[PDB]
Ligand binder design. Structure first.
Ligand SMILES: *[C@@H]1O[C@H](CO)[C@@H](O[C@@H]2O[C@H](CO)[C@@H](O[C@@H]3O[C@H](CO[C@H]4O[C@H](CO)[C@@H](O)[C@H](O)[C@@H]4O)[C@@H](O)[C@H](O[C@H]4O[C@H](CO)[C@@H](O)[C@H](O)[C@@H]4O)[C@@H]3O)[C@H](O)[C@H]2NC(C)=O)[C@H](O)[C@H]1NC(C)=O
Ligand SMILES: *[C@@H]1O[C@H](CO)[C@@H](O[C@@H]2O[C@H](CO)[C@@H](O[C@@H]3O[C@H](CO[C@H]4O[C@H](CO)[C@@H](O)[C@H](O)[C@@H]4O)[C@@H](O)[C@H](O[C@H]4O[C@H](CO)[C@@H](O)[C@H](O)[C@@H]4O)[C@@H]3O)[C@H](O)[C@H]2NC(C)=O)[C@H](O)[C@H]1NC(C)=O
Ligand SMILES: C[C@@H](O)[C@H](C(=O)N1CCC2(CC1)Oc1ccccc1O2)c1ccc(Cl)cc1
Ligand SMILES: C[C@@H](O)[C@H](C(=O)N1CCC2(CC1)Oc1ccccc1O2)c1ccc(Cl)cc1
Ligand SMILES: CCCCCCCCO[C@@H]1O[C@H](CO)[C@@H](O)[C@H](O)[C@H]1O
Ligand SMILES: CCCCCCCCO[C@@H]1O[C@H](CO)[C@@H](O)[C@H](O)[C@H]1O
Ligand SMILES: CCCCCCCCO[C@@H]1O[C@H](CO)[C@@H](O)[C@H](O)[C@H]1O
Ligand SMILES: CCCCCCCCO[C@@H]1O[C@H](CO)[C@@H](O)[C@H](O)[C@H]1O
Ligand SMILES: CCCCCCCCO[C@@H]1O[C@H](CO)[C@@H](O)[C@H](O)[C@H]1O
Ligand SMILES: CCCCCCCCO[C@@H]1O[C@H](CO)[C@@H](O)[C@H](O)[C@H]1O
Ligand SMILES: CCCCCCCCO[C@@H]1O[C@H](CO)[C@@H](O)[C@H](O)[C@H]1O
Ligand SMILES: CCCCCCCCO[C@@H]1O[C@H](CO)[C@@H](O)[C@H](O)[C@H]1O
Ligand SMILES: CCCCCCCCO[C@@H]1O[C@H](CO)[C@@H](O)[C@H](O)[C@H]1O
Ligand SMILES: CCCCCCCCO[C@@H]1O[C@H](CO)[C@@H](O)[C@H](O)[C@H]1O
Ligand SMILES: *C(=O)CCCCCCCCCCCCCCC
Ligand SMILES: *C(=O)CCCCCCCCCCCCCCC
Lengths: 326, 326
């Protein structure tokens, strides 16, 4: 008897006291104090104030500067759009519902907010996977006679959408489902209930393999071979100080990006391992939602790492922000 | 009968309904809805998350990099400390009281939070005034045989403290007073009550002249002469492209800083002019507090303009953040 159970939701709180209400009808102030909902709102406000400008500005400086519109940068524009999906589909909606103490948009806004918030995070995840593959192909040159072109970059973007739809769409059709999560103010895939009517268990395994394990392997393989290829070539030209500097900075950026991915990826693995073991105990609204809580920050630091730390993007943004000067 | 009146406070709400309570005892939810207090909390959280790192990091990179510890930069360290006073003395306290709906620290925490929050904003104001004077003396060279030294920079910092104490201390001694302001969650100088026991009217005139008009004149005079002196000298060396570039960027930075000062300064003048005229009508909790609401942002954008846009500070912060590399 961990929580209270009903049609289209699961409240992580026992109803032996009789105080539990529908997360669509009444505020869930037994899960957390009202000020904790306000701090959830403050967190959403922080993410919106930092997440929209950075991501929208990536799309804006690309319009003003011709040198940014290269095929290898298409996946970064896709990343910026994905974060805006997280910012408006997820963070903005949650800020509004948080101040009500419950998900005021009903069971259908759950499918809406859940889909778009899940889609944005999925598109961002695979955009990092695709960017890893694209850079691997360009540097390591695995294909004998291959040139990365505009059509190849469009496929990579379309591939993220297919993979993101592969995760976000089944819950609408009958494989898993969208229910309020955590403090019941935002919606997402139901990892919290073994709902046999929608075969939730099979969907969690599918998510764990296809959308969790595979992205880590692909990212680790591609960037590993890239750093190996770069260090191998620089070893053949140790007379060039620039090549040695270029090798150092490429390695350092790969380390930064891989550490960044792990910071978002490990909390899910740690919590899941703590649920694989310690399986018996009940779970408050912060058991599996703690990884998701901090993963929202990726909408801010991912553009900082991949776009703001890009050399050309930075100069173009400085020029754009400064009315064209400096 | 604009608001309700009592010992040590003035609530901007009529008590004909009988619902008004002491801003020290009970929440002021007739001034604003609970979610509006939460948004006040979210605003404080945004200012804290942006204001503490930027300002503390100014103090931190100065410790790691010897070239930053120049006398002309002392007033910028004073500015960073001033903003931390605003961040901890003001923003942090307000975030806590906001979630209670009233000033839970009583009439004495009013004198405490009011003093330190007023002191931080005053130190920052005069630090910009002193930096304007210091740069004017160094560039325009008004004194015939003068060299700006370490002792001269220490006087400039001490001068800001004397001026800031000249404003923040009288309310504790009997000239004006500290009362809850706006939504009664933060404390400050009483511009809202003609309290004849503390001669509030004379203090407002004193603040308007010494701490509002004079800082604008000094800043406008110093930077005007500086831009004039720089453009005059560059006109004598139009063969030097760097001098012309240096003149352009100095002028552009002065414009940025003066526009920034006006953005913080004009709303006070606009509201005061709208109170000088239209004197009869009553005022909600957002009449004179709207300038103060947006002036809190100076704790974030002032370090961005004066420190983050400094050439040496930027490279030192990048090196410090990047564990010493790049
Ligand atoms: C967590 O657990 C709590 C407690 O069990 C659940 O809350 C209860 O939900 C039931 C509905 O299933 C509520 O029962 C309904 O109450 C209505 C109002 O009752 C009050 O008002 C009447 C006056 O109209 C008073 O006389 C009465 O004493 C109550 O104070 C009634 O109108 C309903 O009556 C109808 O349904 C019943 C069958 O349930 C029929 O017998 C009637 O003839 C009539 O058709 C009904 O009694 C109950 O009041 C709720 N209790 C509390 C404390 O809120 C939550 O639903 C549960 N949470 C989740 C998520 O499931
Ligand atoms: C805005 O305006 C409101 C309304 O005028 C003010 O709120 C009132 O404040 C007064 C205090 O000045 C309150 O009066 C006191 O109420 C106490 C509680 O009364 C209730 O409970 C008793 C049972 O104990 C009931 O019988 C009664 O009907 C009430 O429902 C009393 O204990 C107090 O009595 C003492 O003082 C009076 C003199 O004031 C003596 O005659 C008594 O013998 C005894 O010594 C007193 O009556 C009043 O209740 C408040 N009203 C409301 C609605 O809150 C706010 O103070 C004002 N705001 C500001 C900032 O000034
Ligand atoms: C993009 C988003 O949609 C995706 C997700 O939210 N996921 C739910 C939790 C997840 C991973 C998938 O973690 C699990 C642990 C054990 C079993 C199933 C699990 O699914 C995700 C993928 C990678 C990262 Cl770095 C962060 C989030
Ligand atoms: C540092 C802070 O302490 C100072 C202040 O808060 N002030 C209260 C309002 C103030 C100015 C002084 O505006 C008035 C208008 C009419 C009469 C009296 C007035 O006082 C301040 C000075 C300059 C600026 Cl840019 C912003 C704030
Ligand atoms: C680093 C600073 C951490 C501060 C944590 C503050 C946690 C406050 O916690 C709150 O305290 C109130 C009493 O003060 C209680 O009434 C509330 O129920 C409780 O949630
Ligand atoms: C910019 C963000 C705006 C958010 C508006 C939040 C409005 C909350 O609305 C409040 O919800 C409560 C239930 O929790 C009700 O009891 C209150 O009557 C209602 O005012
Ligand atoms: C480094 C990889 C970046 C991908 C970040 C995606 C984070 C998405 O986080 C996800 O958000 C969904 C909707 O809010 C929730 O349903 C999921 O529980 C949560 O894991
Ligand atoms: C998929 C993630 C792969 C990350 C590969 C990081 C490999 C780091 O490798 C290290 O890089 C340093 C760079 O100066 C060198 O000094 C070290 O000798 C080298 O071992
Ligand atoms: C010590 C601080 C720990 C903070 C962890 C809080 C985790 C709360 O859980 C959160 O509940 C919200 C309700 O809608 C969801 O939107 C978030 O995705 C979820 O992470
Ligand atoms: C740009 C978007 C602006 C959104 C402003 C939302 C203002 C909401 O305002 C709130 O609406 C609620 C009903 O929805 C009422 O119950 C509350 O009393 C009211 O404060
Ligand atoms: C990190 C910020 C922590 C802020 C903690 C806020 C605690 C608010 O505490 C709440 O105040 C209400 C009065 O407004 C009381 O009615 C509630 O009983 C009390 O829980
Ligand atoms: C460009 C000049 C920067 C100075 C910014 C200082 C802003 C201070 O703002 C002041 O804060 C006080 C305490 O919060 C309040 O009492 C005052 O009403 C308010 O004007
Ligand atoms: C105290 C505030 C003084 C601000 C002085 C700003 C003077 C701007 O002056 C302008 O600067 C431009 C720079 O390229 C020149 O092109 C213009 O000819 C010149 O008039
Ligand atoms: C359209 C949005 C306008 C927002 C203006 C809100 C002004 C509220 O007024 C604010 O009240 C607070 C109560 O402690 C004080 O801390 C702030 O200094 C004061 O500016
Ligand atoms: C040139 O590239 C710079 C042009 C001038 C921009 C300076 C102002 C930037 C302000 C950014 C900080 C805003 C703080 C808001 C905090 C809520
Ligand atoms: C070198 O100068 C950079 C070193 C690596 C730093 C990259 C990570 C920076 C993260 C900043 C963004 C944090 C976002 C948090 C949002 C709440």
């Amino acid at each position: 008897m961990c929580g209270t159970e009903g049609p289209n939701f699961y409240v992580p709180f026992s109803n032996k006291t009789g105080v539990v209400r529908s997360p669509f009808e009444a505020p869930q102030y037994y899960l957390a104090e009202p000020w904790q909902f306000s701090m959830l709102a403050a967190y959403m406000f922080l993410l919106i104030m930092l997440g929209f400008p950075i991501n929208f500005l990536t799309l804006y400086v690309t319009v003003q500067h011709k040198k940014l519109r290269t095929p290898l940068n298409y996946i970064l524009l896709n990343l910026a759009v994905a974060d805006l999906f997280m910012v408006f589909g997820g963070f903005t909606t949650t800020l509004y519902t948080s101040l009500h103490g419950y998900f005021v948009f009903g069971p259908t806004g759950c499918n809406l907010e859940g889909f778009f918030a899940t889609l944005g995070g999925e598109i961002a995840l695979w955009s990092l996977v695709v960017l890893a593959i694209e850079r691997y192909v360009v540097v390591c040159k695995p294909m004998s006679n291959f040139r990365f072109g505009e059509n190849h970059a469009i496929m990579g973007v379309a591939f993220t959408w297919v993979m993101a739809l592969a995760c976000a769409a089944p819950p609408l059709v009958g494989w898993s489902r969208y229910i309020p999560e955590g403090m019941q103010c935002s919606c997402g895939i139901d990892y919290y209930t073994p709902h046999e009517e929608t075969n939730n268990e099979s969907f969690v395994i599918y998510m764990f393999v296809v959308h969790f394990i595979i992205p880590l392997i692909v990212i680790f393989f591609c960037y590993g071979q890239l750093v190996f290829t770069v260090k191998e070539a620089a070893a053949q030209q140790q007379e060039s100080a620039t090549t040695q500097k270029a090798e150092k900075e490429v390695t350092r950026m790969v380390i930064i990006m891989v550490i960044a991915f792990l910071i978002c990826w490990l909390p899910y693995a740690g919590v899941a391992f703590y649920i694989f073991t310690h399986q018996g105990s009940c779970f408050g609204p912060i058991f599996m939602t703690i990884p998701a809580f901090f993963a929202k920050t990726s909408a801010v630091y991912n553009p900082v790492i991949y776009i703001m730390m890009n050399k050309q993007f930075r100069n173009c943004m400085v020029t754009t922000l400064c009315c064209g000067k400096n």
